[PDB]
Amino acid sequence: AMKWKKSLAGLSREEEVMAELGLTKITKLSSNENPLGTSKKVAAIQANSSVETEIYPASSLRKEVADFYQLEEEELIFTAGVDELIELLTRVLLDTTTNTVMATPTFVQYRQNALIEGAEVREIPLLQDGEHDLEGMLNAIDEKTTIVWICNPNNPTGNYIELADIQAFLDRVPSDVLVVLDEAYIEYVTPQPEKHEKLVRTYKNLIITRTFSKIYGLASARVGYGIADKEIIRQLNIVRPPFNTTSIGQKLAIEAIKDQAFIGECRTSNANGIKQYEAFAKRFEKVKLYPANGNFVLIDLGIEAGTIFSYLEKNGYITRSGAALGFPTAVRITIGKEEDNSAVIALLEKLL
Amino acid sequence: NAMKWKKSLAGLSSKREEEVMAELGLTKITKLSSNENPLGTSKKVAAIQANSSVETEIYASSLRKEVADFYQLEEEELIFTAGVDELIELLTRVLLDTTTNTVMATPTFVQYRQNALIEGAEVREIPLLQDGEHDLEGMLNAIDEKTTIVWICNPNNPTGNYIELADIQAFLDRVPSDVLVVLDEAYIEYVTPQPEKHEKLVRTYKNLIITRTFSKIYGLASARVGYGIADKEIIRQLNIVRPPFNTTSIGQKLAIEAIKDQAFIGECRTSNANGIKQYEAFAKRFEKVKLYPANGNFVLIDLGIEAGTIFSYLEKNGYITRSGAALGFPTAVRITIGKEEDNSAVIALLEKLL
Helix, strand or coil: CCCCCCHHCCCCCHHHHCCCCCCCCCCCCCCCCCCCCCHHHHHHHHHHCECCCCCCHHHHHHHHHHHHHCCHHHHHEEECCHHHHHHCCCCHHHCCCCCCEEEEECCCHHHHHHHHHCCCEEEEECCCCCCCCCHHHHHCCCCCCEEEEEEECCCCCCCCCHHHHHHHHHHHCCCEEEEEEECHHHHCCCCCCCCCCCCCHHHHCCEEEEECCCCCCCCCCCCCEEEHHHHHHHHHHHHCCCCCCHHHHHHHHHHHCCCHHHHHHHHHHHHEEEHHHHHHHHCCCCCCECCCCEEEEEEEEECCHHHHHHHHHCCCCECCEEEHHHCEEEEEEEECCHHHHHHHHHHHHHHH | CCCCHHHHCCCCCCCCCHHHCCCCCCCCCCCCCCCCCCCCHHHHCCCHHHCCCCCEEECCHHHHHHHHHHHCCCHHEEEEEEHHHHHHHHHHHCCCCCCCCCEECCCCCHHHHHHHHHHHHHEEEEECCHHHHCCCHHHCCCCCCCCEEEEEEECCCCCCCCHHHHHHHHHCCCCCCCCEEEEEEHHHHHHHCCCCCHHHHHCCCCEEEEECCCCCCCCCCCCEEEEEEEEEHHHHHHHHHCCCCCCEEHHHHHHHHHHHCCCHHHHHHHHHHHHHHHHHHHHCCCCCCEECCCCEEEEEEEEECCHHHHHHHHCCCCEEEEECCCCCCCCCEEEECCCCHHHHHHHHHHHHHC
8 A cells, every 4th residue: 555666566595495306416607696606815814703793883995995996985986895886886876767688687776776766767688698778878878878787798788899989989979978897797707807997987977887796706795896986986886885794804805906916817717617518508509608708608508597506506506597597598697617627528428 | 977876876875803902002902982791692603613714605494493493483484584674675675776765773783774765765763762762753744655664773772772572563553554663672681571483473464574583682793693583475585695705604503503502691681780780870860961871782972972972982992882872872882781890890980080
């Protein structure tokens, strides 16, 4: 009987399944947390801390991160995961009288938060190869458009848009429209893009979002951050919640950005995992492998997503079903260690 | 040229231990500003923490069973949230926008108003009574066809006033069954005499959600865990909109244990009640002082001196408090009830200003 927003209609455990199947080792490959874990140096901090001194308070982390990207601390905002930043963005800019532009299928959290704020969502279907249709998205932009979202690399497809095409897009976008460049996966791209944190100085309507929850392997403690010019950061500050991270989460992230050697080796093992899946798609014509540039692959088998999900799961691999992702006959599989990529590929092959 | 920020943001406003204590040079400092249990956590909760490394997963079955059982509720009448603050934000996001209004007392917990403004709602803020009580009647008068939420903080932050259950009910009887009433009971475990159980009122008043936390009496500082109690319809709806982030594996473990440990709750409640008695002995001696009827674990003391001065005076003498300037009382401090000797030290300092 309550008077809930009408825009609301439009949105609508590991040990569990394992004891239900009589399986020993079950391998989880459904979330894109780094399967290799963290640095040894970051691991030593975790093992060194008791959740008995833990609290929600950092100059340390602001400074460390600003020094890493050669930026001003004034250009950073920290948040308890990038999901939280997405929430904040929508609360400050979206409403009944506004619209927002994004791709489908992309990360569900944009449309979810946009719909909760009562915004009109204009969703531009990917190109057939899985790319953002940057052209259609520019055409959708309006005087009522307040936010354009670019997921780069894309989740769930993996596609990556080169900087030159990001810059071309930003030139044409009106300067009073915020463009959120979601770079949750950027550390996985090979070869690595050139430094473009500074882009935010050129385009005063740009925010880049990044997280410690993927490659850094700290989805545990939840640290995400936004890079944007001062004016944007200051506005975002006014509206953040009473607490974010624990002082330990912050301690862990300081060490994470320092251990680039771990990120190097991860970036390379991941690219090898991806090569594994490519050999597989090249063997089987009827399979559709989207272009992978993060730490997951999206594979359309022409088999119902739920069936693929159960089959892999009943053989001891949890993956992310495509029916949740906008792909009724695909699954998204996180790239893990080589010996696990191999076993999933062997299982898929029997289907084909 | 700026981004197209919503206009409702204009009317929005805007760690201590180690930095402040060195940025002064005191031996130690005592924090009596945040209302988290200064006596800490139960010893069993403690033992779990001390035997648990910082390795921790995000994502509630054992917890909702354990809490549903402790209150004799159905599990589907509960929603769990990363602190009561998230629930407050959740509520405002499902029910408030530019075309709505919400009613609340003033001064009350600042987050009700904050989140209302962001969502763009009109906030009809009803002044507290002289005694610090909610002007319940004034709040009935302020309800409209466009009102979607009424907020009731009980016991109130920052005044401490408690509204008796039979009064709650008499108000809820008048409220349109169309308007969500949020009864914020973050401090309810400090009230003596302890109130009748009233969790099951949500079965009578289908427009009622009650909100509680593990952040005050339960002392959970590691974990941030809040929950609401409402009828299944309200929960079902709130479930749709909840963030993917919720709370740690260990946070949930810790709360399962915290709620089973009711001996600690009993000792704290009586120890807290003794602390309040001390402040009452103090107000009785000084007719100049205005002490509010405290039923949570803090006192609001109006000394007729600027909030900022009281705050400095206490801080520089080892005691961090909450300035009434942040809380709507330019001439008070809100002081958390701690150990007996800490309460004594604070009363003695205040007396020298008097």
